[PDB]
Amino acid sequence: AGFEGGQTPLYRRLPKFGFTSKMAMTTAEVRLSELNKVEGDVISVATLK
């Protein structure tokens, strides 16, 4: 994986870009169709857990 026989591989002719965010890994997106698994009427972060 990552070898073309000698020409600089595609993952090295192109530049690295962007940075990883720590916030993105602790922010979860919740769908309206998943709410049937909640017990009760309150929808909070602790209740989604």
Binding site: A1, Y11, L14, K16, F17, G18
Partner: protein, 64 residues
């Protein structure tokens, strides 16, 4: 346990999209005075990894 290793340098240049991967374009780091302003403008931004090349990207980045 023993897991497949991501190509950690190929993950810094390819990002998962819905139906494929995206990437930056080359020829934009240095010597930019001689390039027409169309090149500076259309070499700027995202493209999609080619259909030809995205089997390699799938083998290099198995987890994205």
């Amino acid at each position: 346990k023993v897991k497949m290793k991501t190509k950690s340098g190929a993950a810094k240049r390819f990002k998962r999209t819905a139906n494929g991967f995206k990437r930056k374009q080359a020829f934009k780091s240095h010597i930019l005075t001689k390039k027409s302003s169309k090149r500076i403008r259309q070499l700027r931004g995202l493209k999609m990894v080619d259909k030809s090349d995205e089997a390699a990207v799938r083998r290099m980045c198995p987890y994205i």
